[PDB]
Amino acid sequence: TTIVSVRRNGHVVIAGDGQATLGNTVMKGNVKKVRRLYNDKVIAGFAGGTADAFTLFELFERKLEMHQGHLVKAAVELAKDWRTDRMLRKLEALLAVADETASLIITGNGDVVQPENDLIAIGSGGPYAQAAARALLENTELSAREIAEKALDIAGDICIYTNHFHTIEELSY
Amino acid sequence: SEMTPREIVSELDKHIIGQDNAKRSVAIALRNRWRRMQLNEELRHEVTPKNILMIGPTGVGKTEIARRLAKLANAPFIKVEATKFTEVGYVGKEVDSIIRDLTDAAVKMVRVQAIEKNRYRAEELAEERILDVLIPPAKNNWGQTEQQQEPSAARQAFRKKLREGLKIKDAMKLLIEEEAAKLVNPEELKQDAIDAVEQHGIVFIDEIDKICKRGESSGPDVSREGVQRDLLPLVEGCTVSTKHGMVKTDHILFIASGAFQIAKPSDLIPELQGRLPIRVELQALTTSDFERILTEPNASITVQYKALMATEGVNIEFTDSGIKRIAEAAWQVNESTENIGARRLHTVLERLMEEISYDASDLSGQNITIDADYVSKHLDALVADEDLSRFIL
């Protein structure tokens, strides 16, 4: 799959495709890889278990609960539980979460990464997404949503594991 | 009519070397309790103890200062290990116990303090009882109203011949533990300690830093922070149920103590940080500090040892160099092995004197002089040999 987050001006987005693959066949084509959390204040995307995500997004949203809402802290506190607990440690998936403050990547390896210009591109198509998301953010005035989306379509074109079904979320401030 | 901070620091200097800031800090806390009593009903309520948090390594004075402070104020004092309560996640114990245990000791106080503020008088009246059995001398009326009035005459001579001279002695003691009691009021005595605990109580919480955090693990941090949580009421002001009544922690002074090498005071839970307005650091001691600790405190271990040997009729004298050589020994072991602060002086000093301490009863009448030589003769080997150190010093 491919998830692409971009942040320009007062907008930050997270777009993802809808293909779910098994072997060499497409299982589903309209999977919802992006969603809103923490009273719509937080937007996130996931690459992997359509349920593993569920479990994760919630716990994450449990971190933001009694930690004011500090995106970064609750994010590192999550990867912490994630890499520890046998339960959490069991599930595998790439997490891409953003918010007014900043966007970052969370992984099972208890890793909390924040790409260069808050530009995230995970999933089997992340590279393609990023290469295109770059060429644009670099030589274009296009909005965060226009790049995320245009970059996402480019990925879908190259990546055999990503389709052109989008699911975008945004955040304005 | 309490002493001023400088005066408090001074008394403290009589027992603790260095660590001046911690003194001033603990000094202001005390003075403020006086300052509080000096206000209007209104303010007396709002003004809460300015609790302190001591930050520093092992055995460099933290507790001693707290203990000497309490003594100076004659305040009931109690020391407690924070981690004790993390065990409650198994069985442990509850924190309220701190205020309860405090009260028990605050009673053991008021009692022994009272039984003493009476044992004298109870001994005199005791005489009049015995002296009464030998002779009711005088009485209302009986003879002359002036010259023949005073009965003392015989009684007096009888008295003296008794004080200096059933069983009068056996009987008196039974009368001492009969008149003293009949003079103590157990009701005001029980409420006595309670007023103390509430007005002067001092709680020393060691290891507060072993109750912080670190992404270590979910389970352990929860229990840790649990003890902090359970500590809030005691520190924010609450009511605890005591075997001798109910107590209001609201004015008990709290001195929390932490090394804080792994964890920081900022890791403490917010409601507690706000209740530890005073933060103070204590420094690691230096060999110099050791030398001074060895002899300066007005009841230093060296002065102590001197007295014990005198008890055996043996005059012990320490040489300046001997003292320096001793301090050096303690320092070296602390660095070569495990650093345990001034505590090490006690072990070293004590090993240095084993032979004398045993032979003392036979050396009666001699002039032993512990000098640099003697010290090196007895310690160097041990000090040098590390493994031996870990067992012997």
UniProtKB/Swiss-Prot annotation, chain A:
Which of the seven top EC classes does this enzyme belong to? hydrolase
Query: Outcome of mutating residue 2 to S/V, per the record?
Result: 80% reduced protease activity
Keyword entries, A-Z: Allosteric enzyme, Cytoplasm, Hydrolase, Metal-binding, Protease, Sodium, Stress response, Threonine protease
Residues where Na(+) binds = 156, 159, 162
What highest taxon heads this organism's lineage? Bacteria
Please indicate if the UniProt record lists Transcription as a keyword.
no
Q: Temperature note from the UniProt entry?
A: Optimum temperature is 55 degrees Celsius.
Q: Which GO terms describe its cellular component?
A: cytoplasm; cytosol; HslUV protease complex; proteasome core complex
EC number annotated for this UniProt entry: 3.4.25.2
What controls how active this protein is?
Allosterically activated by HslU binding.
Presence of keyword Ribonucleoprotein? no
Induced by what?
A: By heat shock.
GO MF annotation: an example: threonine-type endopeptidase activity
Task: From the UniProt record, give one GO term of the biological process aspect.
Answer: response to heat
Positions of the catalytic residues:
1
Which reaction is the catalytic activity of this chain?
ATP-dependent cleavage of peptide bonds with broad specificity
**What family does this belong to?**
Belongs to the peptidase T1B family. HslV subfamily.
* Free-text function comment from the UniProt entry: Protease subunit of a proteasome-like degradation complex believed to be a general protein degrading machinery. The complex has been shown to be involved in the specific degradation of heat shock induced transcription factors such as RpoH and SulA. In addition, small hydrophobic peptides are also hydrolyzed by HslV. HslV has weak protease activity even in the absence of HslU, but this activity is induced more than 100-fold in the presence of HslU. HslU recognizes protein substrates and unfolds these before guiding them to HslV for hydrolysis. HslV is not believed to degrade folded proteins.
Q: Which NCBIfam families match?
A: ATP_dep_HslV (TIGR03692), PRK05456.1 (NF003964)
The molecule here is called ATP-dependent protease subunit HslV
Tell me which species this is from.
Answer: Escherichia coli (strain K12)
Q: Which gene encodes it?
A: hslV
UniProtKB/Swiss-Prot annotation, chain B:
What happens when you mutate residue 275 to E? Answer: Complete loss of activity. Forms wild-type complexes with HslV and is able to bind ATP
Q: What family does this belong to?
A: Belongs to the ClpX chaperone family. HslU subfamily.
Q: Which PANTHER family match?
A: ATP-DEPENDENT CLP PROTEASE ATP-BINDING SUBUNIT CLPX-LIKE, MITOCHONDRIAL-RELATED (PTHR48102), ATP-DEPENDENT PROTEASE ATPASE SUBUNIT HSLU (PTHR48102:SF3)
**What would changing residue 271 to Q do, according to UniProt?**
Complete loss of activity
GO molecular function terms listed in the Swiss-Prot or TrEMBL record? ATP binding; ATP hydrolysis activity; identical protein binding; magnesium ion binding; peptidase activity; proteasome-activating activity; protein domain specific binding
Q: How does activity depend on temperature?
A: Optimum temperature is 55 degrees Celsius.
For this protein's source organism, the top of the classification is: Bacteria, Pseudomonadati, Pseudomonadota, Gammaproteobacteria, Enterobacterales
What protein name does the entry list? ATP-dependent protease ATPase subunit HslU
Q: Does the keyword Coiled coil apply?
A: no
Q: Which InterPro entries match?
A: AAA+_ATPase (IPR003593), ATP-dep_Clp_protease_ClpX (IPR050052), ATPase_AAA_core (IPR003959), Clp_ATPase_C (IPR019489), HslU (IPR004491), P-loop_NTPase (IPR027417)
Q: Where in the cell is it found?
A: Cytoplasm
Going by the entry's taxonomy, the superkingdom of the source organism is recorded as Bacteria
Query: In UniProt terms, what is the effect of altering residue 92 to A?
Result: Almost no protease or ATP hydrolysis activity
**Disulfide partners:** none
- Annotated residues for binding of ATP: 17, 59-64, 206, 271, 343
* Induction behaviour: By heat shock.
Q: How does it assemble?
A: A double ring-shaped homohexamer of HslV is capped on each side by a ring-shaped HslU homohexamer. The assembly of the HslU/HslV complex is dependent on binding of ATP.
Q: Which UniProt keywords apply?
A: ATP-binding, Chaperone, Cytoplasm, Nucleotide-binding, Stress response
Choose one Gene Ontology CC annotation of this protein and give it.
membrane
Q: What does this protein do?
A: ATPase subunit of a proteasome-like degradation complex; this subunit has chaperone activity. The binding of ATP and its subsequent hydrolysis by HslU are essential for unfolding of protein substrates subsequently hydrolyzed by HslV. HslU recognizes the N-terminal part of its protein substrates and unfolds these before they are guided to HslV for hydrolysis.
Q: Name one GO biological process term.
A: cellular response to heat
Primary residence? cytoplasm
